[PDB]
């Protein structure tokens, strides 16, 4: 039984996408098993043989990780952490140092308390069936599933007669149609150097009282630095989010929440207001499940069912557009103004933003104290628009940092 234990997987875990394989009791990079280099000539016989050879150890390595997890923890805890890599593992996809870092970080979280991530995973499992989420991924992933949503729109009851899911599908076809068109068709690497520094402020805002950290901070970290902050390198806890396991007519895909495109696809998919057709009790139970899971993540990021967020021109309500411009004014004029302003709005004291965010610089003077102050100088219309927003959703602030609104 030359199986590697969990410690040898933890040792190789790193924020890198290098393939590792389990072989002869240890897991590491395939080149490091031999002191020298090994060579082969490409040809039609060997590439099909080399691929089968790689496919077969990716699965063996995944199963050795699974076995190592099961030996160290209760099966319920070990299999919850392994679920992150199980569907991709079965397809011969390679186990990498980052996946192991994810799995091990996730295991350290569900060890103490697994209900939180189990809620997230069930929610992520439901939205993985949603065509709206799936076409949203197509927008951020050109090449992976081109034309899925478009050629999906040319369907009806004859093509898709079903009251298990195909009734849920048809109810989302309008939302699919709106969601394919909107955006840059790829969106964009919308960063100015400051968009990295903007998401740093959203991190602090995520840690404000009453605001979600479990979902928002990993998403914000990925958009800022390219990946989340994992445990082994409420609260952010492990920083691991579930996978988007997409099965459709285009194929079988797995999308990591550590990829920026996947975060952006989820972001756009959470924007629009509640689709009451799918939320209807009369609606198919599947459609009820997808929309309820979408509003769950949407609400987690502070976005109410009423909130409608779409990438536009850089549609929003008159008070929304003035509020978004007030947020942009704070972001471009100072580095530490957005968080205290969002805090003031969270307390219903948006009218006090100008005086609260004021910097007082005392000069040398006589007969009292003379100061030099800098204030955001938000207009009365802007303060009112901010006050009309109540608690600004983390999703809206995330839209702003990306330059979407």
């Amino acid at each position: 039984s030359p199986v590697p234990d969990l410690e040898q997987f933890r040792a190789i875990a790193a924020q890198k996408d290098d393939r590792v394989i389990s072989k002869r009791g240890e897991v590491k990079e395939p080149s490091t098993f031999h002191k020298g280099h090994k060579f082969a000539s490409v040809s039609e016989g060997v590439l099909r043989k080399k691929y089968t050879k790689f496919f077969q150890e990716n699965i063996k390595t995944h199963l050795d990780l699974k076995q190592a997890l099961l030996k160290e923890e209760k099966p319920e805890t070990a299999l919850l952490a392994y679920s992150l890599v199980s569907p991709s593992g079965y397809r011969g996809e390679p186990l990498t140092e980052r996946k192991i870092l994810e799995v091990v970080s996730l295991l350290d979280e569900v060890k103490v308390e697994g209900d939180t991530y189990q809620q997230l995973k069930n929610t992520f499992d439901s939205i993985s069936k949603d065509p709206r989420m799936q076409v949203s991924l197509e927008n951020q992933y050109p090449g992976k599933m081109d034309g899925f949503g478009a050629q999906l729109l040319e369907m009806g009851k004859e093509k898709l007669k079903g009251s298990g899911v195909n009734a849920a599908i048809n109810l989302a076809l309008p939302g699919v149609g709106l969601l394919v068109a909107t955006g840059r068709e790829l969106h964009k690497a919308s960063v100015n150097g400051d968009a990295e520094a903007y998401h740093h402020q959203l991190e602090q805002i995520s840690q404000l009282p009453g605001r979600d950290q479990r979902l928002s901070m990993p998403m914000q970290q990925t958009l800022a630095i390219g990946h989340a902050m994992l445990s082994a390198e409420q609260g952010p806890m492990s920083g691991v989010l579930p996978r988007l396991e997409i099965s459709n007519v285009k194929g079988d895909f797995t999308f990591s929440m550590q990829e920026p495109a996947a975060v952006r696809a989820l972001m756009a998919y959470l924007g629009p207001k509640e689709d009451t057709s799918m939320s209807s009790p009369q609606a198919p139970k599947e459609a009820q499940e997808m929309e309820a899971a979408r509003l769950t993540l949407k609400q987690m990021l502070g976005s109410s069912p009423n909130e409608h967020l779409v990438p536009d021109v850089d549609m929003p309500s008159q008070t929304e557009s003035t509020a978004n411009g007030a947020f942009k004014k704070l972001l471009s004029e100072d580095w530490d103004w957005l968080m205290p302003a969002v805090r003031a709005m969270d307390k219903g004291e948006a009218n006090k933003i100008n005086e609260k965010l004021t910097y007082k610089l005392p000069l040398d003077a006589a007969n009292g104290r003379v100061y030099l102050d800098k204030s955001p100088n938000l207009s009365g219309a802007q303060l009112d628009a901010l006050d009309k927003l109540g608690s600004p959703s983390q999703l809206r602030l995330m839209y702003l940092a990306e330059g979407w609104i």
């Binding site: 890198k16 080149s31 082969a40 080399k50």
Partner: protein, 130 residues
Amino acid sequence: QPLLDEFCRLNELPPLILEDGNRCQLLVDDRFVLYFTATEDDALMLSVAFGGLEKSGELRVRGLELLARANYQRVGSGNLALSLAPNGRQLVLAGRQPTEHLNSANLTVWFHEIIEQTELWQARFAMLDQ
């Protein structure tokens, strides 16, 4: 032109038959693909794709910055150079040498150097995250 037969026979290397566009390929340690292409200019160009660059964000900028300044130094013999593929993501390390100054023992030096340098740039571009 098929003079490499001494070089592979020298170091126990599998055959290198340049076919269907005078191209021949080798597999290094199950991770990299080496390309032995014959320039029309009587030169031997070695090229190996060794990884990927991030599609977007600050990770791409840091890799772009790393790629631009890396070619300033003498990275390798034969004017070995770092480059980005037309797809915008694959990292390519390529260099060439005129065949007239290429026997077999000198190939081995140039052959190990591209491998050693290909290993080093795969690691440095995978170690950008900090």
